[PDB]
Design a protein around this ligand. Structure first.
Ligand SMILES: COC(=O)c1c[nH]c2ccccc12
Length: 112
């Protein structure tokens, strides 16, 4: 993969996540434990991740191969499933994003 070429493969999968409204909204910026009133968040989630950080990394050439991008998308979902209760709104939003991602990322992975 070459840098332009990688963005063209991965960006549609990231746009598909941003397109989910309202489900993507809580993921469009880093979790802010003090704004939200969840000060234990960083005690549970060691390595935070969100759509704005993934987008910045993709735009600036920080991913060289699809697996590195996939790792950060996974990490964003895994953190939200770890911290939030299974019947909570944010957990269900996370699951919807993950279902979209599973579909959108598959053609990229099958091409490798
Ligand atoms: C990714 O967002 C979370 O994990 C959140 C946890 N509680 C929240 C309340 C409002 C918005 C986001 C979150």
């Amino acid at each position: 993969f070459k840098p332009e070429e990688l963005r063209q493969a991965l960006m549609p999968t990231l746009e598909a996540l941003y397109r989910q409204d309202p489900e993507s909204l809580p993921f469009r910026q880093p979790v802010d434990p003090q704004l939200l009133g969840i000060p234990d968040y960083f005690d549970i989630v060691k390595n935070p991740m969100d759509l704005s950080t993934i987008k910045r990394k993709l735009d600036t050439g920080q991913y060289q191969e699809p697996w590195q991008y996939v790792d950060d998308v996974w990490l964003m979902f895994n953190n939200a499933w770890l911290y939030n209760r299974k019947t909570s709104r944010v957990y269900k939003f996370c699951s919807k994003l993950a279902e979209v991602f599973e579909q959108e990322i598959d053609p990229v992975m099958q091409s490798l």
